[PDB]
Amino acid sequence: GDERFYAEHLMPTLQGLLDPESAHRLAVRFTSLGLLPRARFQDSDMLEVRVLGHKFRNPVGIAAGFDKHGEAVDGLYKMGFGFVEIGSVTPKPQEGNPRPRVFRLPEDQAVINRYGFNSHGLSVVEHRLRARQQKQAKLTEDGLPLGVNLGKNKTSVDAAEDYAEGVRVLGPLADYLVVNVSSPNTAGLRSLQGKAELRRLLTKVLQERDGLRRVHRPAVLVKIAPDLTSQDKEDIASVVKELGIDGLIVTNTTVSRPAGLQGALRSETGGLSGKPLRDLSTQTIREMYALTQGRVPIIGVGGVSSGQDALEKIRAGASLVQLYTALTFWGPPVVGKVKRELEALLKEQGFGGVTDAIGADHRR
Numbered sequence: 417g418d419e420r421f422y423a424e425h426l427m428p429t430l431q432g433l434l435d436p437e438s439a440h441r442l443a444v445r446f447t448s449l450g451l452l453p454r455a456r457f458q459d460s461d462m463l464e465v466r467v468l469g470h471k472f473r474n475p476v477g478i479a480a481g482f483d484k485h486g487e488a489v490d491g492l493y494k495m496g497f498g499f500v501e502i503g504s505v506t507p508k509p510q511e512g513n514p515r516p517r518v519f520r521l522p523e524d525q526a527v528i529n530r531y532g533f534n535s536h537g538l539s540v541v542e543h544r545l546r547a548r549q550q551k552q553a554k555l556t557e558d559g560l561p562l563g564v565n566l567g568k569n570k571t572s573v574d575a576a577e578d579y580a581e582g583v584r585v586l587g588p589l590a591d592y593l594v595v596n597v598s599s600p601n602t603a604g605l606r607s608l609q610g611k612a613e614l615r616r617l618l619t620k621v622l623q624e625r626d627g628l629r630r631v632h633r634p635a636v637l638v639k640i641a642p643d644l645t646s647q648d649k650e651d652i653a654s655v656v657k658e659l660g661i662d663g664l665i666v667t668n669t670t671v672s673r674p675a676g677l678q679g680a681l682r683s684e685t686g687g688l689s690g691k692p693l694r695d696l697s698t699q700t701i702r703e704m705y706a707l708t709q710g711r712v713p714i715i716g717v718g719g720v721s722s723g724q725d726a727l728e729k730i731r732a733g734a735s736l737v738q739l740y741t742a743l744t745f746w747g748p749p750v751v752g753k754v755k756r757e758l759e760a761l762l763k764e765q766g767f768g769g770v771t772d773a774i775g776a777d778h779r780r
């Protein structure tokens with residue numbers, strides 16, 4: 417599994433033969449079948465992180481959206497990810513938007529997607545996870561946690577109830593749950609990021625979570641957008657502190673279109689991911705870390721494709737990071753690359769380990 421071979425030949429050829437969504441479906445199939453290049457990199461103690469009531473062998477996870485229905489969890493761990501997050505999952509099954517709904521921006525090392533929460537639904541995912549529940553229990557104990565990202569149905573009349581249902585159904589199977597109120601492709605979803613609605617929504621979510629039996633009680637995190645106003649961020653930080661939310665995932669895709677995008681499909685509707693989002697995400701992490709006084713665990717996501725990208729987010733305040741778009745361009749080998757580069761940079765910058773670097777920029 418040569419990083420250069422996948423980056424220079426395999427992936428480019430694959431993308432030249434298959435459209436984005438087809439490539440993705442194949443990716444999921446191959447991953448679930450274990451058809452992956454050998455993960456040479458061996459995790460060192462330096463990369464181990466303890467947060468959210470769990471141990472993570474390494475801080476690099478697969479972001480939500482790649483394995484929406486929980487079909488390739490084990491294959492993703494085999495890829496080298498320190499933790500896996502599936503979803504978003506909606507209460508009832510739904511098809512999402514018509515195709516095409518995902519677009520590549522090669523010149524920008526970016527992607528634009530408007531899937532619209534295509535989901536097999538809670539019931540299907542529930543049984544799929546139950547079939548490997550004990551196997552996961554051992555993985556988690558082994559330092560390989562599982563996260564479940566919750567969404568809401570398009571025609572739902574009670575947003576809060578949709579999330580409450582997800583907590584009750586998939587909460588017992590997850591190490592952590594994500595209340596995703598930052599999808600740019602669901603009408604009025606990001607509005608749930610407002611203070612009044614957010615507090616009511618999260619109060620209900622936490623009540624349902626607290627009602628679960630001890631060993632089946634997951635940490636609850638909120639995934640936010642990179643397009644929030646300063647006021648929005650202040651409010652989120654306030655509610656997080658008020659309710660005791662366990663953590664934040666920063667960030668989801670952006671509806672902004674940074675000047676400089678070259679892709680012919682730059683004006684397609686949807687959320688932009690990849691390099692163009694990287695620093696916007698890092699800065700959002702930096703601000704949320706400060707607003708929460710570094711007391712709230714943050715999973716950094718957005719444009720991570722190298723060890724430097726990962727370390728910048730960690731130094732900005734992230735305890736863990738995730739990636740997705742980088743995988744679509746460079747393939748499976750990118751996971752080992754990021755981990756190897758991160759370890760080298762940590763040493764090079766005098767950090768005994770990842771934990772020591774969390775929020776380092778704020779202390780200089």
Ligand SMILES: Cc1cc2nc3c(=O)[nH]c(=O)nc-3n(C[C@H](O)[C@H](O)[C@H](O)COP(=O)(O)O)c2cc1C
Nearest residue numbers: 479480481503504529668689690718719739740741
């Ligand atoms: C094709 C695609 C589908 C996604 N689906 C979801 C989703 O269902 N739920 C979610 O919370 N984020 C979703 N995301 C967002 C990613 O989890 C992540 O927040 C974002 O893409 C930034 O990371 P990246 O630049 O490494 O891709 C999706 C992203 C892409 C590119």
Ligand SMILES: O=C(Nc1c(F)cc(-c2cccc(OC(F)(F)F)c2)cc1F)c1ccsc1C(=O)O
Nearest residue numbers: 436439440443446447451452518520743744747748
């Ligand atoms: O999943 C996308 N890409 C991917 C991807 F992440 C991973 C991928 C794999 C997975 C496992 C083994 C591989 O090596 C092999 F077996 F093939 F040799 C290649 C193939 C892919 F095509 C997306 C998503 C949204 S858009 C898009 C894309 O533009 O390709």
Ligand SMILES: O=C(O)c1cc(=O)[nH]c(=O)[nH]1
Nearest residue numbers: 531532533599601669687
């Ligand atoms: O499913 C989608 O369209 C979607 C959801 C989400 O949270 N983020 C994203 O980029 N796309």
